[PDB]
Every structure is written in C-alpha cells, then in structure tokens.
Amino acid sequence: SQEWTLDIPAQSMNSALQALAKQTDTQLLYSPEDIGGLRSSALKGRHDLQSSLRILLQGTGLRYQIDGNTVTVTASAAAKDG
Secondary structure, three states: OOEEEEEOOOOHHHHHHHHHHHHHHOEEEOOOOOOOOOOOOOOOOOOOOHHHHHHHHHHOOEEEEEOOOOEEEEEOOOOOOO
C-alpha cells in the first residue's frame, strides 16, 4: 500500500510537478522553459509515485527517471526505450 492520495493541478506542468514534489517528499528536475507551458494531466487520487509519474507524463514523449527521492524528467528524442 505504498501509494498516496495526490492533489495535482491540471494547469501548467511546472505547477503540477512542483506540487507533487512537496506532497510526496520528492525532488523533481524539469525545465519550466522547455515545457512550453503545457497543461498537465491531473492525477488526483490514490496511486504510487512511479505509477503516477507514468500516467501524468505519458503524452509528452518525455522520459522520467525515478531514483529514490530524485525524479528527473528528461527529453529523449529516440524511439528506443530501455
């Protein structure tokens, strides 16, 4: 039951990620300029951190690196995931 009740904004992605950070005790690395002010896919409910990241991120063609308390959202322009 290592899941949380999230409260994520559906506005600019910069807000959603920062909100998730404080609320799950995680550090999220992202570029506010590089996200073009895209609206995030609000996932406010009960889900696990990695799972929530996957659901929220899916749609931006980005890759999320989750390591302990570090979440690094990088843009991998390669159709070759591993």
